[PDB]
Amino acid sequence: VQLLESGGGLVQPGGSLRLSCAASGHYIMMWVRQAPGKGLEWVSGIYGGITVYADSVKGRFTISRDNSKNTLYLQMNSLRAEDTAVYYCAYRRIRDEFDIWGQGTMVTVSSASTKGPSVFPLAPSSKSTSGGTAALGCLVKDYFPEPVTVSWNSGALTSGVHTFPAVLQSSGLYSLSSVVTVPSSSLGTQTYICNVNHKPSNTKVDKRVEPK
Amino acid sequence: DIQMTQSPSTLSASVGDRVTITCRASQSISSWLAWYQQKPGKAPKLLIYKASTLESGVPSRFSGSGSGTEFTLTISSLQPDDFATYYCQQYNTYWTFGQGTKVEIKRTVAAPSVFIFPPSDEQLKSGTASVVCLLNNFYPREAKVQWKVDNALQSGNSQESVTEQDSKDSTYSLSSTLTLSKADYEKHKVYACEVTHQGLSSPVTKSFNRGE
Ligand SMILES: [Cl-]
C-alpha cells in the first residue's frame, strides 16, 4: 500500500482547498492534522459511507471518497489561521498492517506575500562576554514563507552555532536568530559573517558582525 | 467528548533504560487504544493496537498493557532510535489523541550562559526594536526568562524559541526576543533579562542601558 497526498498550499483566510489522498497497492479512512508545535488532532473520518467530524471543523470541512479512483478527499472551506497544519490521511483495517499513513500535505492559511528577511547584527560586547567566551549572531526578521537557512563564514564555522526555530509574529511574518559562541580572544583576530538565504524571495545576504 | 491524557509530558532517560508512559481516558474505552511514535518532520508510526497487539514489523522491545481507563506503553531497553514523541489514541468513538510524551536524553545539570543583545541602530531606523536574550547550552530544558524594563516586569511583548537537544552534548539553547516600537523603546533606560534555572543557585540578570 502507498497513500499519495496532494492539494495542500497557501491560501488567504476565508479561502478554500481540496485535499486528496490516493491509494495504490473494508476500510476506515481518517484525516488527522498537526499544527506547528502542537500535537496530533483527529479531524474527520469515513467508515455505507458514514461520515463524522471533530467539533473544530464541523460545518466547514467535508470528507468524501471516489471508489473508482481509489481516492479520499477533504474539502476545506472558510479557512482560518488556526487551520495551518500538516494534514495526514490514514487508512485503518476494518496486509498484516493495521494502519497505513500518508506523508502529509502542508496547509498554510495566511494573507502574507513572499518577502525576504531583514538581517540585523547581534554584536558581541561586554553584555555578551562571560569568562573568556563571547556570543554573537544575526537576527533574521520579517520573512515569508518558511524556510531560511543560515551559515557562518560560508560553512567554515559550525562549532558552537545554534540557529533557532522560527517564530510566527503577530504581523504574520516569521523571525529567527542564529547565534554562535567563540573565544573572546578571537574577537579582534577573526571576522564573523552570517550568510542568510531565503530561496522563495531569491535573497542571499552576507552580514559582518563587528564587535563593540 | 473522550479526553485522553498522558503522563509524564516529558521523560528523561538513558540508552538501555526501561521506560514507561501512561495514558488515561475520561471514560472507559475497553481495549480500543493505540500507541504511536512520531519523529520531527514525519508521519506518526503505529506501534501497538488493541492495547497490547504489536503492529507488524515493530520491534519487540515495545509492549502495551492495560484496559478501560488506564494504559501503559513499556519500552524494555531504550535505543537511540526511540528518543521521540509518543501519542496514545482512543478509537472507541472516532479517534482522539493524547497530548504527547517526549522521551529525551538524560544528562548532568548544566546552567545556561546568559547573553543580552541591544537592538542595532540599523534596525531602529526600521521603527522597531528587538532585544534578544540568549540562554546557551543548558540542561534540563525547563527555564524561565523574565524581561524587566527600568525594573518593570514585562508581559505579552516577547516570544521564545528553543533548539532540539544537541546531538553531541545533549543540551538545549533558548532565545527570548522582546519587541517594542522605536518610540516605546526610547521611553526607557534599563533593559534586563532575568533567568531562572535548576543549575543557577539564584537568578541571573543581564542588562544594558539604552545608548550606553
Ligand atoms: Cl484528537
Author numbering:
A (entry chain H): 2 to 26, 31 to 52, 55 to 101, 106 to 223
B (entry chain L): 1 to 212
Sentences from the study reporting this entry:
Plasma kallikrein (pKal) proteolytically cleaves high molecular weight kininogen to generate the potent vasodilator and the pro-inflammatory peptide, bradykinin. pKal activity is tightly regulated in healthy individuals by the serpin C1-inhibitor, but individuals with hereditary angioedema (HAE) are deficient in C1-inhibitor and consequently exhibit excessive bradykinin generation that in turn causes debilitating and potentially fatal swelling attacks. In vitro experiments demonstrated that DX-2930 potently inhibits active pKal (Ki = 0.120 ± 0.005 nm) but does not target either the zymogen (prekallikrein) or any other serine protease tested.
However, DX-2930 heavy chain CDR loops do not have resolvable density in the apo structure. Although not directly involved in pKal interactions, the CDR3 residues 99RRIG, Asp-107, and 109FDI that were also included in the affinity maturation rounds make Fab intramolecular contacts that stabilize the CDR3 loop conformation and also likely contribute to the overall folding stability of the Fab.
